[PDB]
Amino acid sequence: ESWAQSRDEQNLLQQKRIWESPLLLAAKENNVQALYKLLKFEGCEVHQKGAMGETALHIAALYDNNEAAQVLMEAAPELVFEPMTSELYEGQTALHIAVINQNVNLVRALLARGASVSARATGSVFHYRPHNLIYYGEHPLSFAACVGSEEIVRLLIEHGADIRAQDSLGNTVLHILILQPNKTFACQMYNLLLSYDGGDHLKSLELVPNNQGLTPFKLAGVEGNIVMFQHLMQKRKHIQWTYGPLTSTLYDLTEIDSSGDDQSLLELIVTTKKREARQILDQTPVKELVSLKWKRYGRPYFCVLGAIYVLYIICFTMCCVYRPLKPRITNRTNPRDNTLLQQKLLQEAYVTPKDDLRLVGELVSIVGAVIILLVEIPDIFRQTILGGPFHVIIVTYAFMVLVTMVMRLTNSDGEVVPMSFALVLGWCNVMYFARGFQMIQKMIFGDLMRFCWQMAVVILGFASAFYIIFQTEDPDELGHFYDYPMALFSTFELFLTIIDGPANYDVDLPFMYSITYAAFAIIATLLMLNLLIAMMGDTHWRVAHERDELWRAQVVATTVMLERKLPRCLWPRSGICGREYGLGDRWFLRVEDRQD
């Protein structure tokens, strides 16, 4: 079907041609007597391309068959240069197979015959695909670095192996070592390849970026390689002094910061779907960074912008609790008796008695919605959620306010449908602002205050909704929300299922109650389910760290969020510059640590 089933067939088709071709069969079985009987007399095709376009030397290189390979090179030395003419292995030579098998004597003999150390194995098997179990690159030097054979690495360098070489994906030999499972052993091989660098400050091998704009140091962070990241950190930190147990080390903090403006480590961790990369922001050069960004500047501006959004939403409800005003006027209350509508769509906006208080309030709800769009719509052009789906809700909230404006100036009967949606999307987006937090126990009390915030926020978005839903309808029948102080008290009682369903079907309710109350039943249970997991997940195991860690990543994702749109006069740059004094120009972070 796909090809996974194809190659399965080609590998079987390979063994079929090996079984058939006696030259390829003797190269596999290492039949030395059968190779001289075959090459010297009885005249054969020594350039015999097998199933996978392989030579007899390729088969003798796949199964360590040194005695059989040396026969194929002394009788026909042209077989060394021949690559795999197939599509699965296009570009692979006999040297690539000898390097991965760590055959030192075969590599020593292949280089003695003059093997190309720059042959790119562009075959489909060597691609960086999930259906390929290993990704080693294309050049034979990169294969030697990935197998951990330091002898073959230097033996290739001695024959002119360019460490500056990049594969099809723009990865140097340093990038490929970071994508290897054996993290603790790849650090040893990483230092061997750096020793053969040009020794010049310009055109450094560690600075050659990926095709996706990623230096090797920057790649270890996006990939969550803890061992390589700590190892690469040794090369970019300077110990200032040692005062006994203290070690006031100075970290580089260059490629771990903004402007690239896409090009930072922090942005790449909070926006990637790789869970494993989360752990990088906990390392000793990075954990001190985001902690200072959140203590000052971060936490205050979060609450300053939080209180601004709290007032911006309570003003929207202030214009809705005293919504616009009509008696039914129409005699349609006699036909279709089920209906209870006392619709208000009294357009006649300009009664000036007190309204002008509402009017300037309605003007605030408009100028704030476009401002929300003026900071989020130009941002979608340049999307992940660990922040919380705040961005998704804050744009749909300003969408409902503008529709209510278009709902207005046309005198539409369905005023209530778009206006009620902006009430929940405005409040329940506030509970996002609960992240304003700096032990098995005070963790129970800490997550409980999360619920009291999220609960009080939800009921203030549905009680104002349920009020509008039944402020127009008749309060004699189904009057759970006849005024505001009892609409909040009935919805609060609703939140704990102590009161029965505000339904009453002798009389037909509006199309919005059968929709708004349905969502109030799911959120009121998920918040009551998210509270039990807080209460129990705190104590049953050290999961609480697992519960803990992400909120911390949620705050880190929010901390990067608050630094993108805020101007330069507020929120100064982290670290200290190095231009006068002395080390400029990169901004460094002074960190001291104690040891026990």
Ligand X SMILES: C[C@@H]1NC(=O)N[C@@H]1CCCCCC(=O)O
Q: Which residues would be at the binding site for ligand X (CB under 6 A)?
A: 52, 54, 58, 62, 89, 125-126, 132-134, 241, 243, 246, 248
Give which of Ba ion, a copy of itself, ligand X, none residue 58 binds (C-beta under 5 to 8 Å, depending on kind): ligand X
The C-alpha atoms of residue 308 and residue 138 are separated, in whole angstroms, by: 56
Q: Which residues bind Ba ion (CB under 5 A)?
A: 497, 500
Q: Which positions from 79 through 108 interact with a copy of itself, judged by CB under 8 A?
A: 97, 100-102
- Give all strands of the β-sheet with 246-251 in edge-to-edge order: 237-243, 246-251, 589-591
Q: Measured from the CB of residue 506, what is the shortest distance to a copy of itself in angstroms?
A: 7
Q: Which positions from 341 through 380 interact with a copy of itself, judged by CB under 8 A?
A: none
The C-alpha atoms of residue 226 and residue 186 are separated, in whole angstroms, by: 12
Tokens of residue 591, six digits: 């960190």
In the bound state with ligand X, the residue whose beta carbon lies nearer, of 101 and 317, is 101
The C-alpha atoms of residue 242 and residue 126 are separated, in whole angstroms, by: 48
Lay out the site mask for a copy of itself across 12-51 (x = CB under 8 A, - = otherwise).
xxxxx--x--------------------------------
Contact status: 384 vs a copy of itself (CB under 8 A):
no
Q: Measured from the CB of residue 402, what is the shortest distance to a copy of itself in angstroms?
A: 29
Q: Is 247 helix (H, G, I), strand (E, B) or coil?
A: strand
In the bound state with ligand X, the residue whose beta carbon lies nearer, of 97 and 534, is 97
DSSP state of 241: E
Give which of a copy of itself, ligand X, Ba ion, none residue 327 binds (C-beta under 5 to 8 Å, depending on kind): none
In the bound state with a copy of itself, the residue whose beta carbon lies nearer, of 182 and 195, is 182
Q: Measured from the CB of residue 347, what is the shortest distance to a copy of itself in angstroms?
A: 31
The verdict on whether residue 500 carries a ligand-binding annotation is yes
User: Do you find a cis peptide bond into 251, omega within 30 degrees of 0?
Assistant: no
Q: Measured from the CB of residue 528, what is the shortest distance to Ba ion in angstroms?
A: 12
Q: Measured from the CB of residue 219, what is the shortest distance to Ba ion in angstroms?
A: 55
Which of 31, 271, 490, 554 binds a copy of itself (CB under 8 A)? It is 490
CA 45 distance to own-chain centroid: 54
DSSP state of 87: S
In the bound state with a copy of itself, the residue whose beta carbon lies nearer, of 362 and 447, is 447
In the bound state with ligand X, the residue whose beta carbon lies nearer, of 92 and 317, is 92
The C-alpha atoms of residue 71 and residue 123 are separated, in whole angstroms, by: 27
Number of residues that bind a copy of itself (CB under 8 A): 88
Give which of Ba ion, ligand X, a copy of itself, none residue 87 binds (C-beta under 5 to 8 Å, depending on kind): none
In the bound state with a copy of itself, the residue whose beta carbon lies nearer, of 101 and 317, is 101
Q: Measured from the CB of residue 241, what is the shortest distance to ligand X in angstroms?
A: 4
Contact status: 497 vs a copy of itself (CB under 8 A):
yes
Give which of a copy of itself, ligand X, Ba ion, none residue 126 binds (C-beta under 5 to 8 Å, depending on kind): ligand X
Distances (CA, A) of 86 to 50, 83, 90: 9, 9, 5
Which of 108, 114, 118, 246 binds a copy of itself (CB under 8 A)? It is 246
Contact status: 485 vs a copy of itself (CB under 8 A):
yes
- Cβ atoms < 10 Å from Cβ of 452: 11
Q: Which positions from 570 through 589 interact with a copy of itself, judged by CB under 8 A?
A: 572, 576, 578, 581-583, 588
Distances (CA, A) of 18 to 28, 75, 113, 290: 8, 20, 25, 60
Contact status: 549 vs a copy of itself (CB under 8 A):
no
Dihedral angle over CA of 507, 513, 515, 521, nearest 10: -110
Q: Measured from the CB of residue 373, what is the shortest distance to a copy of itself in angstroms?
A: 30
DSSP 381-440: T----SS-THHHHHHHHHHHHHHHHHHTTTT-S--HHHHHHHHHHHHTTTGGGG------
Distances (CA, A) of 355 to 144, 319, 364, 420, 482: 79, 9, 14, 20, 21
Q: Measured from the CB of residue 289, what is the shortest distance to ligand X in angstroms?
A: 20
Residue written as tokens 């039949």? 31
Give which of a copy of itself, Ba ion, ligand X, none residue 52 binds (C-beta under 5 to 8 Å, depending on kind): ligand X
Q: Measured from the CB of residue 582, what is the shortest distance to a copy of itself in angstroms?
A: 5
Give which of Ba ion, a copy of itself, ligand X, none residue 54 binds (C-beta under 5 to 8 Å, depending on kind): ligand X
Q: Which positions from 169 through 198 interact with a copy of itself, judged by CB under 8 A?
A: 181-182
Query: Under a CB-based contact definition with an 8 Å cutoff, are residues 67 and 109 in contact?
Result: no
Handedness of CA 114, 119, 125, 129 (dihedral sign): positive
Tokens of residue 148, six digits: 């951990």
The C-alpha atoms of residue 462 and residue 519 are separated, in whole angstroms, by: 9
**Roughly what angle, to the nearest 10 degrees, separates helices 513-537 and 441-471?**
170
Which of 40, 78, 108, 134 binds a copy of itself (CB under 8 A)? It is 134
Encoded amino acid at 54, one letter: E
Task: List the Cα angle 384/387/390 in 5-degree steps.
Answer: 90
Which of 380, 498, 569, 570 binds a copy of itself (CB under 8 A)? It is 498
Q: Which positions from 201 through 230 interact with a copy of itself, judged by CB under 8 A?
A: none
In the bound state with a copy of itself, the residue whose beta carbon lies nearer, of 18 and 395, is 18
- Cβ atoms < 10 Å from Cβ of 118: 12
Q: Measured from the CB of residue 505, what is the shortest distance to a copy of itself in angstroms?
A: 5
Write out the binding residues for Ca(2+).
Answer: 500
